[PDB]
Amino acid sequence: ASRLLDPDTLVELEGVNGEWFDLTNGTEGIYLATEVTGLLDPPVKATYEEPGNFPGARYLNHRVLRRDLVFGVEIL
Amino acid sequence: TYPAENVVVDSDPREEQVSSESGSPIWERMNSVRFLHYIPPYTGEVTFKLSVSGAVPGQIATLRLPRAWSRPWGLE
Amino acid sequence: IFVERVTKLTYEWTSDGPKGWTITIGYKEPEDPILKAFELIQYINSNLGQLGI
Amino acid sequence: AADMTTLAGHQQLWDTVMKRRQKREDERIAPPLIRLWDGDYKLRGQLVGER
């Protein structure tokens, strides 16, 4: 089959004063740039312990960390 | 009514070796006796001779020898 | 050959196996100076008890 | 018992001493037997699997 991949994805920011930015269409002259880390799953720390002098390790706990999100905006 | 004094024996030296589904402290009455020996690597045919008293026809004991390999592919 | 009596033995085991033995031959003060402070304080509390009698 | 008249028995003596030497090596790296007991000294269990 033949197909253009043009996703429906809309990205908007609402600021601390209630002003808005469309980062997809750029009607405020601002666009999200080609580098994003920290969308999708948040970071997790998983903790394990040694079972004494025996094979492997045992699961203790896991914790979701803060989401550190790194991106750029292109400003015309 | 409690369940019968059915026991699970695990010979692994780390865990409580003898335990019962009734919750009875069957680690007492074992009088310091432990299971001490493993089946060594590359052991072929073995006959396990059990014996029982005070049991009726159709009662079933079981054995497991769980096969744990260092690899997905070989070592036999 | 210096000869004296074994005054202390310490054994240590970890999930990496043995660390072996610490042997003290002859009489030695605690190497940690805080433990030398505790040793003097034990002698004081014993003498302080008898002065109360 | 080894024959001290011939080299074959001197090799058996040497190999007997190397066997004893190896059995001591295995007892170097073996951990103590650890056991826990209550007040009144009843055995609760042997401890294996400590960190």
Next chain:
Amino acid sequence: VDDAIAVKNNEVNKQALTYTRR
């Protein structure tokens, strides 16, 4: 690091029990 001072502190606390009691 704080952890190395904390580990040695814990050893001295277990050896001080030679010399003190409640």
Next chain:
Amino acid sequence: VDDAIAVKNNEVNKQALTYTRR
């Protein structure tokens, strides 16, 4: 790290001799 704690321990032992006689 442990060697720095060991050096400071040796210096304290040498200074404790102002205050002690065995």
Next chain:
Amino acid sequence: VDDAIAVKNNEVNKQALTYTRR
């Protein structure tokens, strides 16, 4: 390292005022 030992010492010197006076 020796800086962290100096910080730990200053904290103990302060806490020892609970238990001492001139």
